[PDB]
Write an enzyme that holds these catalytic residues in place. Structure first.
Site, PDB file in Angstrom:
ATOM      1  N   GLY A  20      11.187   0.184   1.197  1.00 54.68           N
ATOM      2  CA  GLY A  20      11.284   0.107  -0.246  1.00 54.68           C
ATOM      3  C   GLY A  20      10.848   1.399  -0.881  1.00 54.68           C
ATOM      4  CB  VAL A  25       7.625  -2.634   5.861  1.00 55.82           C
ATOM      5  CG1 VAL A  25       6.841  -3.800   6.453  1.00 55.82           C
ATOM      6  CG2 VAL A  25       6.939  -2.249   4.563  1.00 55.82           C
ATOM      7  CG  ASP A 133       9.233  -3.084  -9.016  1.00 58.30           C
ATOM      8  OD1 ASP A 133      10.137  -3.394  -9.859  1.00 58.30           O
ATOM      9  OD2 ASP A 133       9.489  -2.784  -7.833  1.00 58.30           O
ATOM     10  CE  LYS A 135      12.465  -5.520  -8.991  1.00 63.30           C
ATOM     11  NZ  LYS A 135      12.857  -4.423  -8.044  1.00 63.30           N
ATOM     12  CG  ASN A 138       8.645  -6.116  -5.185  1.00 61.22           C
ATOM     13  OD1 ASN A 138       9.149  -5.818  -4.089  1.00 61.22           O
ATOM     14  ND2 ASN A 138       8.691  -5.308  -6.238  1.00 61.22           N
ATOM     15  CG  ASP A 154       6.667  -2.981  -3.476  1.00 60.61           C
ATOM     16  OD1 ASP A 154       6.088  -1.931  -3.198  1.00 60.61           O
ATOM     17  OD2 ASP A 154       7.801  -2.959  -3.943  1.00 60.61           O
ATOM     18  CB  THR A 170      15.011  -2.953 -10.690  1.00 53.98           C
ATOM     19  OG1 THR A 170      13.576  -2.812 -10.809  1.00 53.98           O
ATOM     20  CG2 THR A 170      15.765  -1.712 -11.206  1.00 53.98           C
ATOM     21  CG  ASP A 329      -9.486 -20.095 -10.065  1.00 55.38           C
ATOM     22  OD1 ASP A 329      -9.550 -20.834  -9.048  1.00 55.38           O
ATOM     23  OD2 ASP A 329     -10.514 -19.773 -10.694  1.00 55.38           O
ATOM     24  CG  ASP A 406     -17.795   0.442  22.313  1.00 57.33           C
ATOM     25  OD1 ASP A 406     -17.094   0.826  23.271  1.00 57.33           O
ATOM     26  OD2 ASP A 406     -18.975   0.792  22.207  1.00 57.33           O
ATOM     27  CG  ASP A 408     -19.740   5.126  21.521  1.00 54.30           C
ATOM     28  OD1 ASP A 408     -19.280   3.983  21.736  1.00 54.30           O
ATOM     29  OD2 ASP A 408     -20.822   5.508  21.987  1.00 54.30           O
ATOM     30  CB  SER A 410     -20.179   3.824  24.957  1.00 55.99           C
ATOM     31  OG  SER A 410     -20.621   2.607  24.341  1.00 55.99           O
ATOM     32  CE  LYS A 412     -23.341  -0.557  29.790  1.00 56.40           C
ATOM     33  NZ  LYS A 412     -24.599  -0.305  30.555  1.00 56.40           N
TER      34      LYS A 412
HETATM   35  N1  LIG Z   1       3.997  -8.632   4.838  1.00 61.22           N
HETATM   36  C1  LIG Z   1       5.300  -8.564   5.047  1.00 61.22           C
HETATM   37  N2  LIG Z   1       5.902  -9.371   5.902  1.00 61.22           N
HETATM   38  C2  LIG Z   1       7.246  -9.336   6.128  1.00 61.22           C
HETATM   39  N3  LIG Z   1       8.026  -8.433   5.551  1.00 61.22           N
HETATM   40  C3  LIG Z   1       7.524  -7.555   4.728  1.00 61.22           C
HETATM   41  C4  LIG Z   1       6.107  -7.532   4.408  1.00 61.22           C
HETATM   42  N4  LIG Z   1       5.886  -6.528   3.560  1.00 61.22           N
HETATM   43  C5  LIG Z   1       7.088  -6.007   3.296  1.00 61.22           C
HETATM   44  N5  LIG Z   1       8.036  -6.608   4.027  1.00 61.22           N
HETATM   45  C6  LIG Z   1       9.446  -6.274   4.001  1.00 61.22           C
HETATM   46  O1  LIG Z   1       9.555  -4.846   4.075  1.00 61.22           O
HETATM   47  C7  LIG Z   1      10.451  -4.388   3.069  1.00 61.22           C
HETATM   48  C8  LIG Z   1       9.765  -3.298   2.241  1.00 61.22           C
HETATM   49  O2  LIG Z   1       8.628  -3.788   1.586  1.00 61.22           O
HETATM   50  P1  LIG Z   1       8.022  -3.096   0.280  1.00 61.22           P
HETATM   51  O3  LIG Z   1       8.315  -1.623   0.430  1.00 61.22           O
HETATM   52  O4  LIG Z   1       6.558  -3.395   0.207  1.00 61.22           O
HETATM   53  O5  LIG Z   1       8.598  -3.857  -0.853  1.00 61.22           O
HETATM   54  C9  LIG Z   1      10.978  -5.657   2.355  1.00 61.22           C
HETATM   55  O6  LIG Z   1      11.984  -6.282   3.161  1.00 61.22           O
HETATM   56  C10 LIG Z   1       9.900  -6.650   2.588  1.00 61.22           C
HETATM   57  O7  LIG Z   1      10.324  -8.001   2.541  1.00 61.22           O
HETATM   58 CA   LIG Z   2     -20.770   2.218  22.028  1.00 62.34          CA
HETATM   59 CA   LIG Z   3     -10.501 -22.927  -8.737  1.00 61.34          CA
END
Ligand SMILES: Nc1ncnc2c1ncn2[C@@H]1O[C@H](COP(=O)(O)O)[C@@H](O)[C@H]1O
Ligand SMILES: [Ca+2]
Ligand SMILES: [Ca+2]
Ligand SMILES: [Ca+2]
Ligand SMILES: [Ca+2]
Length: 449
Positions: A20, A25, A133, A135, A138, A154, A170, A329, A406, A408, A410, A412
């Site tokens: 996008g 992605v 953006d 929509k 997204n 997004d 858009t 919420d 962990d 470093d 190591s 542990k």
């Molecule tokens: N978490 C997600 N899981 C699956 N598809 C994703 C995810 N994030 C983005 N995409 C897909 O990657 C593309 C680019 O995403 P974006 O640039 O964030 O809008 C669109 O097809 C999204 O549906």
């Molecule tokens: Ca360590």
């Molecule tokens: Ca609540």
């Protein structure tokens, strides 16, 4: 350590998902747990607009958003060419396709969807993030399950990064002030209002064959409920849309006012039933165990539950969460937990009156649960406290937690390395350090005596 990358050591790229506005992605896979993720890969040299330190602080605030309708981000990693932003993978596709498939939604179905957009946007705005953006392309469906949660994607990268540099449709969702160079909280409310108008009618309120004519309509802010299908939609839904598509943004209602509108309340009456008792019984068993353990135990568990659990594991707790979340919420406040516990008892046939009341119990539990001090129990805090401890103790999950700490490499954990996770110890072989086997005992002991 010289031949280990941060991203490449932990994850393998499986394939491309899409591209996008910012970066690209891909689907990736944890090489130990085999759990799959979405990763956004951003080219540093092309795309950076701020120093790295700025970018990591801004992205860290994005990782801290914990709301069921907001994309979950787990980490930001880097190599010499890229940032890798690793999130939860959603498989249900865009809400856009669901509009295409369905054409139009009933008032009940539209309210259940838009209410989640309101919830997610309210929470964003409380954390001073504007979408910009919003929509249907997204917003993603968590899965293919019926009535699964929606996820807002997004957003959050537009000041840190420059865009890639012909999105169709858009122009439908833009508020009029956006044409004047303005983006603010109220532009998201307008975009959400256009989405609602489309869910109910199947058709954009500012409509037209091409970008020119559409933009002309947007600009006047003139729209109507004139289409035949509107005669059959309630005055309450129209009242809400009018408040959201109010021309002057200072007269336009806030996202919280959207969330609280009576039309939403009329279709969000979800509440615990008899069929939820098994879920509720289990959640409560596990929440008492949690209250019992050291602050250190509680701390490690929150970290593990928030990083390493999956959708399948939490879906029933997700549902219980949603039913307790009375005001929609996306978080549980003190009264909601008190009512929820009273409702659990009523359903079970047990009288609440029966040494310590429900209200004292909840009051003493809030501070332990509300680990960030937010005033509410967010999604991840509820999952940590309400899930079966067991589930988190898979060997692969412990290995990944061990490797997170962990620093470093190591083999542990040191005292300094270990604080990271919680922010006395017991060593059996007494090197003053925790190899994996001791760490497993330590975590296993948290659940146990
Ligand atoms: N978490 C997600 N899981 C699956 N598809 C994703 C995810 N994030 C983005 N995409 C897909 O990657 C593309 C680019 O995403 P974006 O640039 O964030 O809008 C669109 O097809 C999204 O549906
Ligand atoms: Ca360590
Ligand atoms: Ca609540
Ligand atoms: Ca909290
Ligand atoms: Ca040791």
């Amino acid at each position: 350590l010289y031949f280990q990358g941060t991203f490449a050591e932990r994850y393998n790229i499986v394939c491309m998902l899409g591209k996008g506005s910012f970066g690209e992605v891909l689907k990736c896979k944890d090489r130990i747990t085999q759990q799959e993720y979405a990763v956004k890969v951003i080219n540093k040299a092309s795309a950076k607009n701020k120093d790295t330190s700025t970018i990591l602080r801004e992205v860290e605030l994005l990782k801290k958003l914990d709301h069921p309708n907001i994309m979950k981000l787990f980490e930001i990693l880097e190599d010499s060419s890229s940032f890798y932003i690793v999130g939860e993978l959603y498989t249900g596709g865009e809400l856009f396709d669901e509009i295409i498939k369905r054409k139009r939604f009933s008032e009940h179905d539209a309210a259940r969807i838009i209410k989640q957009v309101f919830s997610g946007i309210t929470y964003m705005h409380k954390h001073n993030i504007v979408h910009r953006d919003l929509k249907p392309e997204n917003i993603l469906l968590e899965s293919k399950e019926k009535d699964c949660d929606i996820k807002i994607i997004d957003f959050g990268l537009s000041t840190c990064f420059q865009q890639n540099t012909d999105r169709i449709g858009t122009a439908y969702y833009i508020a009029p002030e956006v044409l004047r160079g303005t983006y603010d909280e109220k532009c998201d409310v307008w975009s959400a209002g256009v989405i609602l108008y489309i869910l109910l009618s199947g058709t954009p309120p500012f409509y037209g064959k091409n970008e020119y004519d559409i933009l002309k309509r947007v600009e006047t802010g003139k729209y109507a409920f004139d289409l035949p299908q509107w005669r059959t939609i309630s005055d309450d839904a129209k009242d809400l849309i009018r408040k959201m598509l109010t021309f002057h943004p200072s007269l336009r209602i806030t996202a919280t006012q959207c969330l609280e509108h009576p039309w939403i309340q009329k279709y969000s009456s979800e509440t615990p039933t008899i069929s939820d008792l098994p879920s509720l019984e289990s959640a409560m068993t596990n929440i008492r165990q949690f209250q019992a353990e050291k602050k250190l135990a509680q701390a490690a568990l929150l970290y593990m539950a928030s990083k390493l659990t999956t959708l399948d594991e939490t879906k029933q707790l997700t549902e219980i969460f949603r039913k307790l979340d009375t005001n929609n919420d996306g978080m549980l406040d003190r009264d909601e937990l008190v009512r929820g516990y009273h409702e659990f008892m009523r359903l079970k046939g047990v009288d609440s009156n029966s040494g310590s009341t429900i209200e004292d119990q909840i009051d003493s539990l809030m501070p332990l649960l509300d680990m960030d001090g937010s005033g509410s129990i967010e999604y991840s805090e509820f999952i940590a406290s309400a899930i079966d401890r067991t589930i988190l103790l898979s060997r692969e999950r412990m290995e990944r937690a061990f490797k997170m700490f962990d620093k470093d490499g190591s083999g542990k954990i040191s005292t300094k390395e270990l604080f990271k996770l919680f922010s006395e110890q017991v060593d059996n072989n007494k090197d003053g350090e925790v190899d994996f086997n001791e760490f497993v005992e330590m975590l296993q002991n948290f659940v146990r005596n």
